[PDB]
Design a protein around this ligand. Structure first.
Ligand SMILES: [Mg+2]
Ligand SMILES: [Mg+2]
Ligand SMILES: [Mg+2]
Ligand SMILES: [Mg+2]
Ligand SMILES: [Mg+2]
Ligand SMILES: [Mg+2]
Ligand SMILES: [Mg+2]
Ligand SMILES: [Mg+2]
Ligand SMILES: [Mg+2]
Ligand SMILES: [Mg+2]
Ligand SMILES: [Mg+2]
Ligand SMILES: [Mg+2]
Ligand SMILES: [Mg+2]
Ligand SMILES: [Mg+2]
Ligand SMILES: [Mg+2]
Ligand SMILES: [Mg+2]
Ligand SMILES: [Zn+2]
Ligand SMILES: [Zn+2]
Lengths: 402, 402
RNA sequence: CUCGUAUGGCGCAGUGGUAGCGCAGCAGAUUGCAAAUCUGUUGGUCCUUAGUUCGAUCCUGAGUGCGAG
RNA sequence: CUCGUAUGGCGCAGUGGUAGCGCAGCAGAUUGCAAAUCUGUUGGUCCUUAGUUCGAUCCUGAGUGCGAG
């Protein structure tokens, strides 16, 4: 049927260069899936692929959202799906490339629809949703559909809220809506993952940042600060829209000698981002597509043309020709990455909650662990031990007095 | 979503015993997928699972077709699909077990519908279909949609015919009908493959046959011969319906001291059957479901409870609980079976035809090879060589005669 | 004791110029027959020996093996 | 050759009764914010050392160490 090629991986692994080669080599167009590249201008820090390097290959859902807007999942779903459709009926093959792998879920119906399902929210319902109180919204969720509630932590405000929002707008338990989902890949998709050993990557990513603040990144940081300022924006705003970008909020303190510190902080966010991406690919993406993915070793850039270019053009050539793939799926070196051990094995599968009546966080609430495995980690952490000692010694004083 | 469990493998590997355990252990019913077990009575040779061993677990699409009928793919598709539906709405989980893995295709839309698409066949069209002439029907196919025709051998009458039949009844090129197919797994399916090393299996299968002609198989062979006779049936009939069974046509010569020979012939068909099943599972089934299958080592029956029962009950437990599977998917020992090398690598992917103008079969037609790889095998076979020598030596009598 | 036959794993063809086929084995295919069907292909130097002959798997002798009298 | 002064990977505190805070690091979560967000956690027993005291990282005397006339 209608094919679709997706390229996953961290940054600094040639995700773009490959997206193009395939585009020219197989008559396709690119669809961006980076939650930050969808914003206007600000290319250097948002790391966009320079036009004079796109060989005139079309690109969709990229650089068109105004800084005043807030991009999100569903928005991408309607936009991405449109590009796919269009590109198909035009006899071309879509090549979705991005860093926000979370969005890829759209390619296999992994989301709930609360748009078409309209419903006036009750004064009572809203008062609970938009409530300022902490666990008031959580206790409500536990009340109606405790199945889904036992899958989140009481502090996961963003999500606990979302869940309830669904229970209301759809009048159907979210937990049930899931046990009924298909989660089957739409269209015939081919997943290509460009990977590189952590160490070599980190080195590259570090330098990539160094000379990145030379090619004129600072000017973009200033520009963002311009819009940031003259708009009475507080640092709290760095949780929505283009303000989440890695390359701005890191220099906010410098923008009120110490600039060299905001850089290190940026380099760090970058590494963390890369690490989380791989974690997602191994524990979220792969498990979902049942491990139907092909790795491409991009550790030693020196090579690439062989380990990435050829290898991918090969797999893709067979894919497009609506045929089975004979490729190994993962080069001897990266074999373990596709192992159950490095993937579905790590997923949490025990959601029973536990509460330590002796441990409590700064927010006042008591420590609650999820999953027996982790409940024990806590019961053995220095945190718990220490608290357990002050408690005993305290309860002991009287034992002596008496 | 609605789950479905399938059990594949050769015979004599406990396919049934497992189908039951899972049925009791997970609230399910069995669906038979054996092209021969769907016939009435004749249990011993068709190897049906004795009732007093089904723990009262329901079974569908099994033992209900009258010897006068001819079961087939689509028939199974409508019947199997019905049992699935019914079993589902009743809160149960279907467990399809069978030896005819070819039928499993139904679980992932791998077929063409020429029923609902009615159309009066033209006198001209039919005259060509029901034609007695050899390659008359083939040349026609090559004319209308040569793409699909280059995928079959001119002697594959059964299939070349079917292909044309589709071109007519659907007025749409079959080749195109395929490039548009989805071939996506319907429902959420779990494939369990019960495998056993060839040697030990064969030993078991041989004895299984020995004492099989003791438990009263002969009486069934006689019964079949009864219906066979008093019906003016020729041995040619052993290409349709229950007459294809392995355990009858092998004794036809004995039914016109030499009986002991029909047995060996039977044991042989049995082995071949087992070997072809695995070839199918490795080159046909697996490649189609993208290798999403779990192996269960049943070589040493002595164990089984551990390698088969537990292992499967474990995977199944996680599967049913709508969760990701942490199981290894393949025991260290059988690992290579799921390798690309033992699967999609073996598939034919070069369909260009070749004709040896010097080699010809008894039917008079010339030898035609499919696939460069095989075209060369022919050009190097003793057959070709020998024919090439008589040709030269013969043409050498021309220089001398001139 | 009479007369026969002795060919790749088995069952069989064959010609005076160094041999073919069926089955099994191995392999490819499989979108209404599938426990079925189609397709390709690896194995022999024609029991041993001495002669006849330009030359023998095939002709003659002998030995050995199996075969019916 | 007189002074400061060094405490988990780094940056810094600190009570006589066997230690912290920030960074990082590790880990789990993710179904409209995801380059975000939530959550759980490994790390040194306090420069080396002799004594002072019931006791010591914190009191004292050396030796080590970087810096300081
Ligand atoms: Mg590159
Ligand atoms: Mg703007
Ligand atoms: Mg929200
Ligand atoms: Mg991390
Ligand atoms: Mg058993
Ligand atoms: Mg079959
Ligand atoms: Mg075979
Ligand atoms: Mg031959
Ligand atoms: Mg013989
Ligand atoms: Mg002969
Ligand atoms: Mg043949
Ligand atoms: Mg002579
Ligand atoms: Mg001689
Ligand atoms: Mg932290
Ligand atoms: Mg992310
Ligand atoms: Mg001391
Ligand atoms: Zn605690
Ligand atoms: Zn030839």
């Amino acid at each position: 049927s209608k094919k679709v090629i997706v390229i996953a991986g961290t940054t600094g692994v040639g995700k773009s260069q490959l997206s193009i080669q395939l585009a020219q080599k197989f008559n396709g167009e690119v669809i961006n899936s980076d939650s930050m590249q969808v914003y206007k201008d600000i290319p250097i820090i948002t790391n966009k692929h320079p036009l004079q390097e796109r060989e005139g290959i079309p690109h969709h859902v990229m650089n068109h959202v105004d800084w005043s807007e807030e991009y999100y999942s569903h928005r991408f779903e309607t936009e991405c799906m449109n590009a796919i459709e269009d590109i198909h009926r035009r006899g071309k093959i879509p090549i979705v490339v991005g860093g926000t792998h979370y969005y890829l879920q759209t390619l296999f119906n992994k989301r709930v629809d609360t748009k078409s399902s309209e419903r006036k929210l009750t004064r009572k319902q809203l008062d609970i949703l938009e409530s300022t109180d902490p666990d008031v919204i959580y206790n409500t969720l536990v009340k109606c559909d405790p199945d889904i509630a036992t899958k989140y932590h009481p502090n996961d405000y963003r999500r606990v809220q979302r869940m309830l929002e669904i229970y209301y707008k759809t009048g159907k338990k979210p937990s049930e809506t899931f046990n009924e989902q298909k989660i089957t890949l739409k269209f015939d998709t081919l997943f290509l993952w460009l990977y590189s050993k952590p160490e070599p990557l980190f080195q590259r990513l570090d330098d990539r940042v160094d000379d990145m603040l030379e090619r004129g990144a600072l000017q973009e940081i200033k520009q963002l600060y311009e819009y940031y300022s003259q708009n009475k924006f507080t640092p709290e705003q760095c949780e929505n829209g283009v303000w989440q970008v890695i390359g701005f909020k890191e220099f906010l303190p410098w923008l009120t000698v110490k600039l060299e510190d905001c850089i290190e902080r940026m380099k760090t966010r970058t590494r963390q981002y890369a690490k989380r991406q791989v974690k997602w690919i191994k524990k979220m993406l792969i498990p979902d597509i049942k491990g139907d993915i092909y790795l491409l070793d991009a550790t030693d850039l020196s090579q690439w043309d062989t380990n990435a270019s050829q290898r991918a053009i090969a797999i893709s050539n067979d894919f497009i020709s609506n045929r089975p793939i004979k490729q190994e799926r993962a080069p001897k070196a990266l074999e373990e990455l596709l192992s159950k051990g490095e993937t579905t094995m790590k997923k949490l599968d025990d959601w029973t909650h536990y509460t330590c009546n002796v441990c409590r966080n700064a927010d006042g609430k008591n420590v609650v662990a999820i999953g027996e495995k982790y409940w024990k980690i806590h019961l053995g952490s220095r945190r718990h031990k220490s608290n357990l000692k002050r408690n005993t010694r305290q309860a002991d004083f009287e034992k002596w007095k008496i």
